[PDB]
Amino acid sequence: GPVNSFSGYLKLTDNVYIKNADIVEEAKKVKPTVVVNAANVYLKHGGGVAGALNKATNNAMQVESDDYIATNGPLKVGGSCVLSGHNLAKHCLHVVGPNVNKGEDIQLLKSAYENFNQHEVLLAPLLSAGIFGADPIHSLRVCVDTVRTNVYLAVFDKNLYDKLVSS
Ligand SMILES: Cn1c(=O)c2nc(SCCC(=O)NS(=O)(=O)CCN3CCOCC3)[nH]c2n(C)c1=O
């Protein structure tokens, strides 16, 4: 099924690549095995990457997520769960980064990125780097130090992308 046809990425380390792109648009071109969603524990995909991914699935992601959460209860911070990737990928790895702004432990960003290690290749965003308030430079550094498998990072904003590549 999935083909993982990534292109245009800058190689930062042996297993970490980065691109200035829309993760929804990357997922449609790449057709990856796994696309990562930066979620909350209730899998309510209200905005950011999660809202954008859900919209691209025509709200199917939210319906499947609501069914999973009503059954199995919320996730743990730093935890994750594999659901369907719908039309974007084979699977979607919903990962919950810590809500740094609301006082959750930023050390859980290591546990959040350790969920990546169960998958050979992933298309992902920077965890907790949206409204959760984690410094994206710090989120990238935890990603590099923690992820051992192949991760292709999409950063939407160009200015932040240039900051990240230069750091
Ligand atoms: C279109 N598009 C974006 O919009 C976009 N945003 C980012 S920022 C990093 C990801 C992020 O938001 N992580 S988070 O802070 O943990 C989300 C917390 N939310 C709490 C409410 O429930 C949903 C989850 N990167 C983006 N890329 C690459 C992109 O392509």
From Swiss-Prot:
Domain of life of the organism encoding this protein: Viruses
Recorded catalytic activity of this chain's protein: Thiol-dependent hydrolysis of ester, thioester, amide, peptide and isopeptide bonds formed by the C-terminal Gly of ubiquitin (a 76-residue protein attached to proteins as an intracellular targeting signal)
Activity regulation statement: Inhibited in vitro by GRL-0617.
Outcome recorded upon mutating T33A: In strain: Mu/B.1.621
Subcellular location: Host endoplasmic reticulum membrane
Bilayer topology annotation: Multi-pass membrane protein
Function according to Swiss-Prot or TrEMBL: Responsible for the cleavages located at the N-terminus of the replicase polyprotein. Participates together with nsp4 in the assembly of virally-induced cytoplasmic double-membrane vesicles necessary for viral replication. Antagonizes innate immune induction of type I interferon by blocking the phosphorylation, dimerization and subsequent nuclear translocation of host IRF3. Also prevents host NF-kappa-B signaling. In addition, PL-PRO possesses a deubiquitinating/deISGylating activity and processes both 'Lys-48'- and 'Lys-63'-linked polyubiquitin chains from cellular substrates.
Assembly notes: May form homohexamers. Interacts with N protein.
Protein name per its UniProtKB record: Papain-like protease nsp3
Originating species: Severe acute respiratory syndrome coronavirus 2 (2019-nCoV)
